[PDB]
Amino acid sequence: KNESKYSNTFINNAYNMSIR
8 A cells, every 4th residue: 555666765766877
């Protein structure tokens, strides 16, 4: 229920030069 996927909880997930 409501799963947050934003680079393993490190933010700025939108083609930010290999954001893992």
